[PDB]
Amino acid sequence: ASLRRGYQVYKEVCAACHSLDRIAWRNLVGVTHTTDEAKAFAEELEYDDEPDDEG
């Protein structure tokens, strides 16, 4: 419960200046969040895809 609250502090305060690059969204699952909550956090962001057919 403290881990989940700490993630919320990270996300709302620290993440403005600090990365957490070694943590994947799947890492939160069954530790702080359910599969669905973590998928929702991931799905709100955009990531670089492979180039389209015209490159």
Partner 1 sequence: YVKKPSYKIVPHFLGFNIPTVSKWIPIFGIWGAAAGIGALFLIEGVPRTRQDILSKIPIIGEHWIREIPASDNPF
Contact positions toward partner 1, by CB under 8 A?
Answer: 25-26, 29-30, 34-36, 38
Smallest gap from residue 53 Cβ to partner 1 (A): 30
Smallest gap from residue 19 Cβ to partner 1 (A): 21
Give the separation between CA 1 and CA 42, rounded to whole angstroms: 21
Q: Is 33 annotated as a binding residue?
A: no
Q: Is 14 annotated as a binding residue?
A: yes
Closest residue by Cα to residue 10 from 27, 22, 55, 18: 18
DSSP three-state, residue 33: strand
Name the binding residues: 14, 17-18
